[PDB]
Amino acid sequence: ESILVSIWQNVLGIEKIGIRDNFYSLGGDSIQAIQVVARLHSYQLKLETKDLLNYPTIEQVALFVKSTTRKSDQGIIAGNVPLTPIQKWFFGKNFTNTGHWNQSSVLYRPEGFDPKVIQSVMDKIIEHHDALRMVYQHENGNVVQHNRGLGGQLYDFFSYNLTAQPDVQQAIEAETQRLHSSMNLQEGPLVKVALFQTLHGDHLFLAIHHLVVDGISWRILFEDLATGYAQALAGQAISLPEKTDSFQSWSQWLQEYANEADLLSEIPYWESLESQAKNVSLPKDYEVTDCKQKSVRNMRIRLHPEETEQLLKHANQAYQTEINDLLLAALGLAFAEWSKLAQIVIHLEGHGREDIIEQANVARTVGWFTSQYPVLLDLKQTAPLSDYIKLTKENMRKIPRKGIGYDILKHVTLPENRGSLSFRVQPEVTFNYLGQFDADMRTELFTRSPYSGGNTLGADGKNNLSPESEVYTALNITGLIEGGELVLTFSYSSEQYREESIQQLSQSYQKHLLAIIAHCTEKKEVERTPSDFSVKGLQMEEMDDIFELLANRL
Amino acid sequence: VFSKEQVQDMYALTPMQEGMLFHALLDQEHNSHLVQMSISLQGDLDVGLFTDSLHVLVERYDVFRTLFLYEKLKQPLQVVLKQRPIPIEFYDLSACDESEKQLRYTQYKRADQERTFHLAKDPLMRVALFQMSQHDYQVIWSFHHILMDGWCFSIIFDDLLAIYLSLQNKTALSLEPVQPYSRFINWLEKQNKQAALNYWSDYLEAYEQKTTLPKKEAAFAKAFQPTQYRFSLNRTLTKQLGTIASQNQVTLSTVIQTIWGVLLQKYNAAHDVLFGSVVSGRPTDIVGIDKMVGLFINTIPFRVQAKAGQTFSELLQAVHKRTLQSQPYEHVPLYDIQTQSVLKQELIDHLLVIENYPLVEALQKKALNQQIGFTITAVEMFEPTNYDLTVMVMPKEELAFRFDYNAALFDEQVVQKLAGHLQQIADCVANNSGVELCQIPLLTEAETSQLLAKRTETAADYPAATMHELFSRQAEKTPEQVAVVFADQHLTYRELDEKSNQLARFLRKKGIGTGSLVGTLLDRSLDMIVGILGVLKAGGAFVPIDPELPAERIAYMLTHSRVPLVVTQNHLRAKVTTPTETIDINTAVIGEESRAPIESLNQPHDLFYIIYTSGTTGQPKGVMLEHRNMANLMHFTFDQTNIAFHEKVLQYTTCSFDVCYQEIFSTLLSGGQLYLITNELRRHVEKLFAFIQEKQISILSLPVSFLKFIFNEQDYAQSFPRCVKHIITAGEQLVVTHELQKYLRQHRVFLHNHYGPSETHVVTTCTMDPGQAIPELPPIGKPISNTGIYILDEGLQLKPEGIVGELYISGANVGRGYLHQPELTAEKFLDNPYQPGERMYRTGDLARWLPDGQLEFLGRIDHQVKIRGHRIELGEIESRLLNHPAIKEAVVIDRADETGGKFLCAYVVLQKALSDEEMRAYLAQALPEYMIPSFFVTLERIPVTPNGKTDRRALPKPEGDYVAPTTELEQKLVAIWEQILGVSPIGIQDHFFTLGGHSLKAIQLISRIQKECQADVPLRVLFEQPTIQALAAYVE
Ligand SMILES: *P(=O)(O)OCC(C)(C)[C@@H](O)C(=O)NCCC(=O)NCCNC(=O)Cc1ccc(C2=C3CC[C@@H](OC(=O)NCCNC(=O)CCNC(=O)[C@H](O)C(C)(C)COP(*)(=O)O)CCC[C@H]3C(C)=NN2)cc1
């Protein structure tokens, strides 16, 4: 608009500029064009100087001025959504009892948790996060997602008094287990809220179906609930943060990206993996084809606080590793000692929200973003530990993007577009390192309930997956920090392994991780590796050639 | 010592740094891979704080802590160190005497320009401070040309002063983050490199003729001796070019670049010219790039082209469109852009850089903004000049040009005239925007009046009479002398005159009026000379109906001429085909007719003579001449050269052509004796030698081709009588062999190499070299008496000496027109603007005025070869053929392939049986690659058109082993060369340029060789020859 005309009046030193005038007749030049664009930025408008030069007249150029950042949508979005990779995986795997596949948490607030306040916060949090209203409709024999407006019954609400019952814990356990099973994916609330009142205060149970949440989305939901609760309890109208790009648009962009040349250029890598992974096979104590989830036992190992603190602060420096590189190199040695396999395929969950779509902002978007990608670890070269950590470290940077591309090629990309891929590496061992287990316990307005029991959000959530669903991963390994202790959890079917064989694996894990912490913390110098230098394609033999050669030049 | 901890990071070189590292390793013939900035700082700088602020600057920039590692790697790398302190040398000279200060300073500065930076060792900046006086500090910076362009210094010195103001006042820093050059790398990776190169491959499509500017001498050395010629346009003109730019809606830079294009169009002559613009290859698409330090500055082929009638406004817009379209792709390095051209490395040879903001008064501009202790009071810069000419332009209140020119290769008179022409273009274009690209004059009035001196010198007061009277006025002087002889029988001058009177009287009784035409179908015999002169005393146009020609073309000459009468002998009359009476010259009535003269009613302008020729158009052309044309030529020939009464002169040429019916009168009007060859003997060189022995012929006429041929009969030329004194020649672009130089020297021969196209007059320009060493391709000559030779452009405008253009011929030596298709007179003839009311004739010949004032020959414009850059002078190829002793007779011709693409070819006759590849190899020594014949055919004899020129249209077009995949010369060396090139197996000594290789592969090659062959071998070796065996001397 006429902002741009006034900027020509300034930068071309001219008054009474006509609405039609031509930049070169006005005495303009490329030196004026850059200054015009450098002026519009102070109004948050972006214009290309190339467009200003090609279209030298006020109106032609004004038709191409854009805002310097995209405004993400504020409305109540609705309508169809394409199934993202992990959602299509979920409906593909066809669990028995799919409706009861949840995530949950129990909050606590010693000074009480007034019903109408939380109901009003729920009305807002579900209206604002345009994915917690999904419906899965099974039309035409496929499954098709529909995201719906203020059609009523956004969530299911219940309130109970437990103060009169002598066993509060068993009462809340029983009723939360009763809530989990009531999920309808078709035409019903995916969010179940239950308020339990207790002699020492009130508790909030949230259960949300896994198709619409993940760990980051729980951090979003807790901080937006805390802000809404504070706002309403003080008395002002509830004002949640600005909505980033809604899950519908993310799905549409992921459909449109799934066929681009950028993703398909990863095919030679995932081919080079799968063709090499084919015969890699985990031994079992018993051959049994499937097990229901009630067969999942688990067991835990804990590092002491002093060894945990060495891990988190000191041990990374000797190779510039991330925490995962050390936890995986320990898992590698643990499998090498326990199985005596030469090679192993481990599935890694990623946080999923990578910059795959250049315009996309997703940090405030709620949905199931988790990406699955396999990582083949060498166990052959395990002898010199110094050189095994470098090999494992390098694998994690060789992997394209952060593996988000693998699941898109498997479940979204068009079947003629993807070539040699032969997606036959099912999960056997799966790994995920959670950070601080503090997605919950990070605002003073409430805290993780003592009564949480089987309803936790992590791996030890007994209640949130159906007892009669199938075990889709043989070993599921998760780390977390609690009380400043690292706790590594091994979840396995008691029909596929005996307890003494997983106790071996978890003790052999603990010795090899303590070896890696000691090794990387006793090593005084720092040894960078080729992934640390900006040379695209550097290799160890070449990097030590150049570090001999600089020592001979200088 | 070094420990691994010191390296911050490592990077692949960007294409610009690849360019500079190629240069800095190959082009080590000189040491100036270096920029030097000299700054003066009046006031009171504090030496310690300024020394500190330079170290904070070096710690701040990763560029300044880069070292470039290249010697043995898979690929060159940047390596960045966390600390790399640059040398700062401080000198106090406050006590020194003023001449000793300025001496010691200038010595240090010159030594600093000469000391090289080792890219893998030395810190790639130097500083020295000189404390002159007590308040007059000076600083000298020098950096390697690989770090950053000169302009980046305006960023760096702003950082420096911000640091110094901080370190003095103790205030903490206000400097923003360094904008990372890796951001531009990721953008170079984002761009579709194929689509970019495809664009330039489309821009350079029609680029046949390579542009040049006139160079005093060949480029025998890369060592510069720079000079600067600087000049400005007046206020009234500099505001006018800005107004012209505003009205046509283009930038003033596009006005300046279009004016420079129009200059390069008038130099040369081509409507298609190209020169290097220099562009800040900083894409506006990237954040912070105007504060980003590195090599962004790049050169791109600016290319101006016009249509014939295009007005300056239309060209100015077409250039504007082209430069806006080019703007996306200007980040492509010139060495890639060169890869797409047919010319490769040779594409650009001068620059035109326009500077709205110089470094002075952008560095010096800071003054009022800060309380720093000093005022910066000059800055000077020295840079590696890469091109023999750079035109700087600074748009200001006066448009200040500066030619940075190599005084080794440009005469300062060339550069001065270049500046005068550049102003005269600007003057015309500014006074009226709508003028065409033709009819813009280049010339200042001094050179205009100098060129209009050539018409006025060589003027003459010759008597310009009617023609046959001049023979009369000679025959009266010595009638008894023998005038003409044929076989063994002759005429006296009296007999010739009387017999002409008889024929003329009889023709007049037969009704011949002087304006009429009469054919001369006659044998080269006594009767034929009498024929010509009798028809001429009847006044008529004596049509040269050559009896040897096929009857169809003779019938054309007869009918198209509508001739009433013909003079013949009997036996030829089988060739007559027309409703025409015919005077048998033997008839008894002519013998009974009076021998006395008859009263001349003739006038000097009357229709004198006619000719028909071979040609490119199908119909016979029908030239015509007037008596005044012979009068002027004859007086020039007789008074300014020699033919004499004692000379035995051959009419050595066939009667069908221009020279023959001038060499005749050239003998009679001087009083010599004409000998006629019995015309079968004209085909028998051995019998011509015998005839010249028998008759002692003293003056000769040789066709250009005949002169190429005769002296190869080396034993007959040794046997030749020493009576020869003058040779006359005609036909274009004579080739002189050193052998025939020897044979001219043996007899001190006056070779009159005349020239002139038959339609204006038979010759108009003259060269001779009686004792002096002869050029192997003799120049045209001087203009002769009462003629104006000119060189003009398509606007009929003059153009400066030493530059090529179309030859125009004017004066007394110009015919009336063509007899039929008479509007060809309008296509070929004009009234001379430069001698108002003199006739002028447009040749299509390309010609040039030379430094000594001779005219120089470049051939017919329709025939203009322009193969792959080069306006190839074909006579040089023929010269290197004919000077090769194993060749007798050889011819070079322009031929086209099945696409219509031009290629050079040769037709060769040998002295002896040999493998023809030997003479191809001899040319491969004697000639550049662009001018060796593409293929060769070998023959027994080469025929000719009857004018003596080779029948190139009749000669038949030509038609129509070193691989080493298992036959190594030395196994290791060739296998490595193959493994480096990778795209193909390689031949025994295969050629990297025929393989189309590139500089980046070359650096990878040498750096591979340095580790894999262990040869400490100069990269220059690979650019001298790609022949693999050269490494054998280095590895031993
Ligand atoms: P194989 O083929 O063998 O490999 C090839 C090589 C590598 C071996 C080798 O042959 C090769 O090709 N490369 C290296 C050697 C070579 O030939 N050079 C080509 C590589 N590129 C170059 O570096 C070419 C080059 C060298 C030297 C000079 C000299 C200059 C510099 C020009 C000029 O620069 C400026 O600072 N001014 C430019 C104008 N102003 C600008 O800043 C840009 C204009 N536009 C802008 O964007 C502006 O910045 C504004 C103000 C923002 C807006 O303007 P608007 O757009 O109009 C300064 C003058 C000095 C010159 C002189 C005299 N010497 N050298 C130039 C080019």
Short mmCIF file of N, CA, C and O and ligand atoms in Angstrom, two decimals, chain A residues 29-31 34, chain B residues 16 18-20 22-23 26-27 145 149-151 253 278-280 282 297-299 327 334-335 338 345 351 353-357 381 383-387 390 392 402 404 998-1000 1023, ligand 1:
data_model
loop_
_atom_site.label_atom_id
_atom_site.label_comp_id
_atom_site.label_asym_id
_atom_site.label_seq_id
_atom_site.Cartn_x
_atom_site.Cartn_y
_atom_site.Cartn_z
N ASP A 29 17.94 3.53 -9.28
CA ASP A 29 19.03 2.64 -9.66
C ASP A 29 19.08 1.55 -8.60
O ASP A 29 18.42 1.64 -7.56
N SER A 30 19.88 0.52 -8.87
CA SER A 30 20.02 -0.60 -7.94
C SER A 30 20.43 -0.15 -6.53
O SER A 30 19.98 -0.74 -5.53
N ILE A 31 21.20 0.94 -6.44
CA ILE A 31 21.57 1.54 -5.16
C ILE A 31 20.37 2.12 -4.43
O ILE A 31 20.33 2.11 -3.20
N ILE A 34 17.99 -1.33 -3.33
CA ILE A 34 18.34 -1.97 -2.06
C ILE A 34 17.91 -1.13 -0.87
O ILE A 34 17.45 -1.67 0.14
N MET B 16 34.96 -19.19 -6.35
CA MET B 16 35.82 -18.02 -6.49
C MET B 16 37.21 -18.28 -5.94
O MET B 16 38.22 -17.91 -6.55
N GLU B 18 38.50 -21.23 -5.64
CA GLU B 18 39.09 -22.15 -6.60
C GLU B 18 39.72 -21.40 -7.77
O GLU B 18 40.85 -21.68 -8.17
N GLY B 19 39.00 -20.43 -8.33
CA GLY B 19 39.58 -19.54 -9.33
C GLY B 19 40.88 -18.87 -8.93
O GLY B 19 41.89 -18.96 -9.64
N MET B 20 40.89 -18.25 -7.76
CA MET B 20 42.12 -17.61 -7.29
C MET B 20 43.22 -18.61 -6.96
O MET B 20 44.40 -18.30 -7.17
N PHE B 22 43.69 -21.53 -8.46
CA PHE B 22 44.19 -21.90 -9.78
C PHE B 22 45.19 -20.87 -10.26
O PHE B 22 46.30 -21.20 -10.67
N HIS B 23 44.77 -19.60 -10.24
CA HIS B 23 45.62 -18.50 -10.65
C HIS B 23 46.94 -18.46 -9.87
O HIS B 23 48.02 -18.53 -10.46
N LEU B 26 49.13 -21.61 -10.94
CA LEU B 26 49.54 -21.66 -12.34
C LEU B 26 50.28 -20.39 -12.76
O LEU B 26 51.42 -20.45 -13.23
N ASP B 27 49.64 -19.24 -12.60
CA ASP B 27 50.18 -17.95 -13.03
C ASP B 27 51.19 -17.37 -12.05
O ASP B 27 51.04 -16.23 -11.59
N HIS B 145 45.16 -11.74 -2.61
CA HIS B 145 44.01 -11.57 -3.49
C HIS B 145 42.95 -12.65 -3.32
O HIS B 145 41.83 -12.48 -3.80
N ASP B 149 37.72 -9.18 -1.86
CA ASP B 149 37.90 -8.14 -2.86
C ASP B 149 38.34 -6.84 -2.17
O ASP B 149 38.38 -6.74 -0.95
N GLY B 150 38.67 -5.84 -2.99
CA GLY B 150 39.04 -4.56 -2.44
C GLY B 150 37.92 -3.87 -1.68
O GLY B 150 38.17 -3.15 -0.71
N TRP B 151 36.68 -4.09 -2.10
CA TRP B 151 35.56 -3.38 -1.51
C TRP B 151 35.29 -3.79 -0.07
O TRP B 151 34.88 -2.96 0.75
N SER B 253 24.04 3.47 -16.09
CA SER B 253 25.05 2.46 -16.39
C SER B 253 24.78 1.76 -17.71
O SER B 253 25.72 1.44 -18.45
N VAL B 278 31.77 -6.02 -14.71
CA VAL B 278 32.06 -6.57 -13.39
C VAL B 278 30.88 -6.35 -12.46
O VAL B 278 30.40 -5.22 -12.31
N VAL B 279 30.43 -7.43 -11.82
CA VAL B 279 29.20 -7.45 -11.04
C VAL B 279 29.50 -7.90 -9.62
O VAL B 279 30.27 -8.84 -9.41
N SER B 280 28.90 -7.22 -8.65
CA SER B 280 28.95 -7.68 -7.26
C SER B 280 28.05 -8.89 -7.11
O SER B 280 26.84 -8.75 -6.91
N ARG B 282 26.75 -10.61 -5.19
CA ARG B 282 26.01 -10.73 -3.94
C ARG B 282 24.51 -10.81 -4.23
O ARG B 282 23.88 -9.78 -4.50
N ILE B 297 32.79 -10.72 -5.94
CA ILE B 297 32.84 -9.95 -7.17
C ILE B 297 33.26 -10.81 -8.36
O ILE B 297 34.24 -11.57 -8.29
N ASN B 298 32.51 -10.70 -9.45
CA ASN B 298 32.62 -11.60 -10.59
C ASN B 298 32.48 -10.82 -11.89
O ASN B 298 31.91 -9.72 -11.91
N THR B 299 33.00 -11.38 -12.97
CA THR B 299 32.93 -10.78 -14.30
C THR B 299 31.97 -11.58 -15.17
O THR B 299 32.02 -12.82 -15.17
N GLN B 327 20.45 -11.00 -14.58
CA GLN B 327 20.69 -10.77 -13.16
C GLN B 327 20.59 -11.99 -12.25
O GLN B 327 21.42 -12.09 -11.33
N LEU B 334 33.01 -16.89 -14.13
CA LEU B 334 33.37 -16.71 -15.54
C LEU B 334 33.98 -17.95 -16.17
O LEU B 334 33.76 -18.21 -17.35
N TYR B 335 34.73 -18.75 -15.40
CA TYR B 335 35.34 -19.93 -16.00
C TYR B 335 34.32 -21.01 -16.33
O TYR B 335 34.55 -21.81 -17.24
N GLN B 338 32.68 -19.26 -19.51
CA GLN B 338 33.58 -19.52 -20.63
C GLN B 338 33.45 -20.93 -21.17
O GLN B 338 33.57 -21.14 -22.39
N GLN B 345 38.58 -20.01 -23.30
CA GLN B 345 39.39 -19.08 -22.50
C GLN B 345 39.49 -17.68 -23.10
O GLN B 345 39.79 -16.73 -22.37
N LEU B 351 37.45 -4.98 -19.77
CA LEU B 351 36.43 -4.73 -18.76
C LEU B 351 35.91 -3.30 -18.84
O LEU B 351 36.62 -2.39 -19.27
N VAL B 353 33.93 -1.15 -15.90
CA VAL B 353 33.40 -1.16 -14.54
C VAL B 353 32.90 0.23 -14.17
O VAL B 353 33.58 1.24 -14.40
N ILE B 354 31.66 0.30 -13.68
CA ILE B 354 31.00 1.56 -13.35
C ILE B 354 30.85 1.63 -11.84
O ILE B 354 30.27 0.73 -11.22
N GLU B 355 31.37 2.70 -11.23
CA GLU B 355 31.53 2.80 -9.78
C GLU B 355 30.77 4.00 -9.22
O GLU B 355 31.30 5.11 -9.16
N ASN B 356 29.52 3.77 -8.80
CA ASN B 356 28.76 4.83 -8.15
C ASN B 356 29.37 5.23 -6.81
O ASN B 356 29.18 6.36 -6.35
N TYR B 357 30.11 4.32 -6.17
CA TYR B 357 30.74 4.59 -4.87
C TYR B 357 32.16 4.03 -4.85
O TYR B 357 32.35 2.82 -4.68
N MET B 381 45.05 2.42 -3.63
CA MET B 381 45.07 0.97 -3.74
C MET B 381 45.81 0.48 -4.97
O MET B 381 45.71 1.06 -6.05
N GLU B 383 46.28 -3.16 -7.14
CA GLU B 383 45.62 -4.44 -7.35
C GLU B 383 46.25 -5.20 -8.50
O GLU B 383 46.86 -4.61 -9.40
N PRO B 384 46.12 -6.54 -8.51
CA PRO B 384 46.51 -7.31 -9.70
C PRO B 384 45.63 -7.03 -10.90
O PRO B 384 44.52 -7.56 -11.01
N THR B 385 46.11 -6.19 -11.82
CA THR B 385 45.40 -5.95 -13.07
C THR B 385 45.42 -7.20 -13.94
O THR B 385 46.48 -7.67 -14.35
N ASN B 386 44.23 -7.75 -14.21
CA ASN B 386 44.12 -9.02 -14.90
C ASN B 386 43.97 -8.88 -16.42
O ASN B 386 44.22 -9.85 -17.14
N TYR B 387 43.57 -7.71 -16.91
CA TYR B 387 43.25 -7.51 -18.32
C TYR B 387 44.03 -6.33 -18.88
O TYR B 387 44.32 -5.36 -18.17
N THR B 390 41.23 -2.00 -18.64
CA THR B 390 40.03 -1.76 -17.85
C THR B 390 39.62 -0.31 -18.04
O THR B 390 40.41 0.60 -17.77
N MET B 392 37.52 2.19 -16.20
CA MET B 392 36.74 2.63 -15.06
C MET B 392 35.81 3.76 -15.48
O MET B 392 36.16 4.57 -16.33
N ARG B 402 38.43 6.50 -16.60
CA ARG B 402 39.85 6.22 -16.41
C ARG B 402 40.16 4.90 -17.10
O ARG B 402 39.67 3.85 -16.68
N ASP B 404 42.56 2.19 -17.34
CA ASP B 404 43.75 1.51 -16.82
C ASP B 404 44.28 0.59 -17.92
O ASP B 404 43.77 -0.51 -18.11
N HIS B 998 38.94 -29.16 -18.01
CA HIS B 998 38.75 -27.88 -17.32
C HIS B 998 39.73 -27.73 -16.15
O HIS B 998 40.31 -28.69 -15.66
N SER B 999 39.89 -26.46 -15.74
CA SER B 999 40.89 -26.05 -14.74
C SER B 999 40.74 -26.77 -13.40
O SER B 999 41.74 -27.08 -12.74
N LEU B 1000 39.50 -27.05 -12.97
CA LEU B 1000 39.30 -27.74 -11.70
C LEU B 1000 39.82 -29.17 -11.74
O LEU B 1000 40.51 -29.62 -10.80
N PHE B 1023 49.95 -27.19 -18.58
CA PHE B 1023 49.43 -26.18 -19.49
C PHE B 1023 50.34 -25.89 -20.67
O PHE B 1023 49.90 -25.24 -21.63
P1 LIG C 1 40.73 -22.34 -16.32
O1 LIG C 1 39.70 -21.79 -17.29
O2 LIG C 1 42.16 -21.93 -16.63
O3 LIG C 1 40.35 -21.63 -14.92
C1 LIG C 1 40.19 -20.17 -14.97
C2 LIG C 1 41.16 -19.48 -14.02
C3 LIG C 1 40.67 -19.64 -12.58
C4 LIG C 1 42.54 -20.11 -14.14
C5 LIG C 1 41.25 -17.98 -14.36
O4 LIG C 1 41.61 -17.86 -15.73
C6 LIG C 1 39.96 -17.22 -14.11
O5 LIG C 1 39.11 -17.17 -14.99
N1 LIG C 1 39.79 -16.68 -12.91
C7 LIG C 1 40.79 -15.87 -12.21
C8 LIG C 1 41.43 -14.82 -13.10
C9 LIG C 1 40.42 -14.10 -13.97
O6 LIG C 1 40.58 -14.03 -15.19
N2 LIG C 1 39.37 -13.55 -13.36
C10 LIG C 1 38.01 -14.09 -13.44
C11 LIG C 1 37.45 -14.36 -12.07
N3 LIG C 1 36.73 -13.21 -11.55
C12 LIG C 1 37.33 -12.05 -11.27
O7 LIG C 1 37.85 -11.81 -10.17
C13 LIG C 1 37.32 -11.01 -12.37
C14 LIG C 1 37.87 -9.66 -12.01
C15 LIG C 1 39.15 -9.51 -11.50
C16 LIG C 1 39.65 -8.26 -11.17
C17 LIG C 1 38.87 -7.12 -11.35
C18 LIG C 1 39.42 -5.78 -11.01
C19 LIG C 1 38.65 -4.76 -10.56
C20 LIG C 1 37.44 -4.92 -9.67
C21 LIG C 1 36.22 -4.30 -10.34
C22 LIG C 1 35.53 -3.21 -9.54
O8 LIG C 1 34.89 -3.86 -8.40
C23 LIG C 1 34.24 -3.09 -7.50
O9 LIG C 1 34.45 -3.10 -6.31
N4 LIG C 1 33.30 -2.36 -8.10
C24 LIG C 1 32.23 -2.96 -8.87
C25 LIG C 1 31.04 -2.04 -9.04
N5 LIG C 1 30.37 -1.83 -7.76
C26 LIG C 1 29.86 -2.84 -7.06
O10 LIG C 1 30.05 -2.95 -5.85
C27 LIG C 1 28.95 -3.81 -7.80
C28 LIG C 1 27.83 -3.15 -8.58
N6 LIG C 1 26.50 -3.55 -8.13
C29 LIG C 1 26.11 -3.67 -6.87
O11 LIG C 1 25.44 -4.61 -6.46
C30 LIG C 1 26.60 -2.61 -5.89
O12 LIG C 1 27.41 -3.21 -4.89
C31 LIG C 1 25.55 -1.70 -5.26
C32 LIG C 1 26.20 -0.38 -4.86
C33 LIG C 1 25.02 -2.38 -3.99
C34 LIG C 1 24.36 -1.46 -6.19
O13 LIG C 1 24.85 -1.17 -7.53
P2 LIG C 1 23.82 -1.47 -8.72
O14 LIG C 1 23.55 -2.96 -8.74
O15 LIG C 1 24.43 -0.97 -10.02
C35 LIG C 1 36.46 -2.14 -8.98
C36 LIG C 1 37.49 -1.61 -9.97
C37 LIG C 1 38.84 -2.31 -9.90
C38 LIG C 1 39.06 -3.36 -11.01
C39 LIG C 1 40.49 -3.35 -11.47
C40 LIG C 1 40.98 -2.10 -12.11
N7 LIG C 1 41.30 -4.34 -11.37
N8 LIG C 1 40.72 -5.58 -11.21
C41 LIG C 1 37.59 -7.26 -11.87
C42 LIG C 1 37.10 -8.52 -12.19
#
